[PDB]
Amino acid sequence: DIIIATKNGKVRGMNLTVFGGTVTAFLGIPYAQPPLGRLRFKKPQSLTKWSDIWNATKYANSCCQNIDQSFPGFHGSEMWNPNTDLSEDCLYLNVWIPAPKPKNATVLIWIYGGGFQTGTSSLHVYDGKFLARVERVIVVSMNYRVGALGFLALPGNPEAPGNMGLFDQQLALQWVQKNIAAFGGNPKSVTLFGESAGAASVSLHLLSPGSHSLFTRAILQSGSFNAPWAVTSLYEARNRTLNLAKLTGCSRENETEIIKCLRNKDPQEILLNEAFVVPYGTPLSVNFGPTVDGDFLTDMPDILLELGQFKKTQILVGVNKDEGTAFLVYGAPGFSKDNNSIITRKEFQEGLKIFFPGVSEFGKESILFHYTDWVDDQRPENYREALGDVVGDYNFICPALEFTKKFSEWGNNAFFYYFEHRSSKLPWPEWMGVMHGYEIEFVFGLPLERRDNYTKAEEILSRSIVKRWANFAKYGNPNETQNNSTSWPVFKSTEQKYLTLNTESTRIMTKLRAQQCRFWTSFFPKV
Numbered sequence: 001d002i003i004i005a006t007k008n009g010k011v012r013g014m015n016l017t018v019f020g021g022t023v024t025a026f027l028g029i030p031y032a033q034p035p036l037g038r039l040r041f042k043k044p045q046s047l048t049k050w051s052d053i054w055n056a057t058k059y060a061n062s063c064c065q066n067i068d069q070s071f072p073g074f075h076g077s078e079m080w081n082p083n084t085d086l087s088e089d090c091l092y093l094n095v096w097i098p099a100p101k102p103k104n105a106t107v108l109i110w111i112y113g114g115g116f117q118t119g120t121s122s123l124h125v126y127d128g129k130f131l132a133r134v135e136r137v138i139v140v141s142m143n144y145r146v147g148a149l150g151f152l153a154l155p156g157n158p159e160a161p162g163n164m165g166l167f168d169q170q171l172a173l174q175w176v177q178k179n180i181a182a183f184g185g186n187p188k189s190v191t192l193f194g195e196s197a198g199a200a201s202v203s204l205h206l207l208s209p210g211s212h213s214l215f216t217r218a219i220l221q222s223g224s225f226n227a228p229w230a231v232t233s234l235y236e237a238r239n240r241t242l243n244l245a246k247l248t249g250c251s252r253e254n255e256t257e258i259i260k261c262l263r264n265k266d267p268q269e270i271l272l273n274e275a276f277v278v279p280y281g282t283p284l285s286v287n288f289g290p291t292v293d294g295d296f297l298t299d300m301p302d303i304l305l306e307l308g309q310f311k312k313t314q315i316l317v318g319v320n321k322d323e324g325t326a327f328l329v330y331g332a333p334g335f336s337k338d339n340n341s342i343i344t345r346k347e348f349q350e351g352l353k354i355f356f357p358g359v360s361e362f363g364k365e366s367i368l369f370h371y372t373d374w375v376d377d378q379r380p381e382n383y384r385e386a387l388g389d390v391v392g393d394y395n396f397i398c399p400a401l402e403f404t405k406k407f408s409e410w411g412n413n414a415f416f417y418y419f420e421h422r423s424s425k426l427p428w429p430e431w432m433g434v435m436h437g438y439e440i441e442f443v444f445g446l447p448l449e450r451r452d453n454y455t456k457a458e459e460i461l462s463r464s465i466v467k468r469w470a471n472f473a474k475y476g477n478p479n480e481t482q483n484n485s486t487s488w489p490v491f492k493s494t495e496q497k498y499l500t501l502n503t504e505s506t507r508i509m510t511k512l513r514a515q516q517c518r519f520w521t522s523f524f525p526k527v
């Protein structure tokens, strides 16, 4: 019988057979009181104790959220839809332990993405069993509330202060601190890693004083708080919570009466009004996300970064080659998952209007002219590849390098990667390239399972990424092996070297998309 005694009770888990060995899994440990009724929109309250045995034998409920129904039956979009029931009773976490039981194992804590509106830790691409099995690390993942039930903000008001989902993550990091030693983990060697909004969450934990002692190192994939989509000013966050009160019929004179009104609304009526809090409408919009709440985030994040008020430790940061293409099928004219998506100059600027609704006509012309110095003046794909890299550079690559520059300037070693391999099983068309989110299955080692049609090059590369990630967690350096491996050098503001990841060849490059990023850093803020 598999049983472990936490500080709030005792949990029992399962034995899983992985690659001829076994990994012990505990699925769905509650880490907070279910934020129901009076506790909706509040910070997570601590659990007390159970005096029984909690069968942590199945993934728990996912937090209430809207579902991506744009392409019914399509694996490419539904692999991100939650695969458990939805409920506000959703603050649970998962723990993967290598067998035989370790003694001081390093812990990887995964924070999922999904624009702070969607996501769950029970997805197949977040399965921590191979990381536990292949690198002998403990993997932890939690669910945190998303949408308005996680980030509705009346700044200063404890009934709905903002950033509740971030506090959900933080209290799960407190659970790891308090209980992971009972599983064989080292509380003093914990590495947070995540993707997109999860990577942005990780970067925010680097700023929040309440998280300073709850982890050791950080890995950020396709995300950081300085991204345009990552943070809403507290002034704008308050307008949208009152707009959503208007859509619900909850507009009152006192703030606490407004919150009392939305606490008795059915969860499905809150989700159904979330998309309207803003006129529109980027497929990248975050209607309810992190804000300056004066508690988890005491000031605008770019200020505390510039002022050096963040945790000083090693970070690992990187992006994919075609971050932008995933978002053009969600509204840009002429783009389709079933077409080759060749678009015209006109469709390109109308695509710009979709992603840049509040930018002047001069500003849209400058973007266009910076991305139309064709190499083959008469290549059709020119305009559709250009707009993908506009979305990609602006929303991910340039903010990620700007974060790593400014972070590295305070004396800690930073490592930057560029993920260039497209999955051989990727269900999206070839024109979409190496998409946002499709490095995750290589980070979690899914290509190491030789029975899901992956190529041998892909298992080699995934096994390398798994090792570099685990070694950076253990040692603060993503060294793969001492010999017969490409050394991964530190990102510095001077040379800005980064390591590229693909099956063909891992080489060392410099100044990634420097000419494109110079436009978004030093010209675009002036239009």
Ligand SMILES: *[C@@H]1O[C@H](CO)[C@@H](O[C@@H]2O[C@H](CO)[C@@H](O)[C@H](O)[C@H]2NC(C)=O)[C@H](O)[C@H]1NC(C)=O
Residues within 6 Å of the ligand: 471, 475, 476, 477, 479, 480, 481, 482
């Ligand atoms: C480079 O990675 C290697 C592993 O590939 C680390 O080497 C050591 O690994 C053994 C286990 O085989 C441990 O007993 C040692 O303690 C490890 N070394 C250290 C310094 O702890 C090594 O840590 C990495 N080296 C650097 C400089 O990052």
Ligand SMILES: *[C@@H]1O[C@H](CO)[C@@H](O)[C@H](O)[C@H]1NC(C)=O
Residues within 6 Å of the ligand: 001, 002, 015, 022
């Ligand atoms: C895993 O399964 C059960 C746990 O209840 C136990 O009998 C068994 O010894 C465990 N380990 C292995 C290697 O099967």
Ligand SMILES: *[C@@H]1O[C@H](CO)[C@@H](O)[C@H](O)[C@H]1NC(C)=O
Residues within 6 Å of the ligand: 053, 054, 055
């Ligand atoms: C699951 O837990 C219940 C009580 O919550 C217990 O009665 C049952 O035996 C457990 N399942 C097992 C041990 O397989």
Ligand SMILES: *[C@@H]1O[C@H](CO)[C@@H](O)[C@H](O)[C@H]1NC(C)=O
Residues within 6 Å of the ligand: 103, 104, 186, 188, 189
């Ligand atoms: C785990 O490692 C830490 C330092 O990383 C050490 O202080 C602690 O005593 C270790 N715990 C063990 C070996 O049980």
Ligand SMILES: *[C@@H]1O[C@H](CO)[C@@H](O)[C@H](O)[C@H]1NC(C)=O
Residues within 6 Å of the ligand: 236, 239, 240, 243
């Ligand atoms: C607040 O929201 C409404 C949406 O109905 C909008 O008309 C108004 O301009 C907003 N005020 C802001 C964003 O300052």
Ligand SMILES: *[C@@H]1O[C@H](CO)[C@@H](O)[C@H](O)[C@H]1NC(C)=O
Residues within 6 Å of the ligand: 333, 334, 335, 336, 338, 339
């Ligand atoms: C395919 O491309 C055309 C070209 O404009 C576009 O209008 C259409 O929406 C795309 N998708 C389908 C299913 O036709």
Ligand SMILES: *[C@@H]1O[C@H](CO)[C@@H](O)[C@H](O)[C@H]1NC(C)=O
Residues within 6 Å of the ligand: 451, 452, 453
């Ligand atoms: C690819 O298909 C399945 C993957 O689920 C696997 O069982 C099979 O052996 C692989 N190879 C071939 C030739 O089908």
Ligand SMILES: [Cl-]
Residues within 6 Å of the ligand: 310, 311, 312
């Ligand atoms: Cl400091």
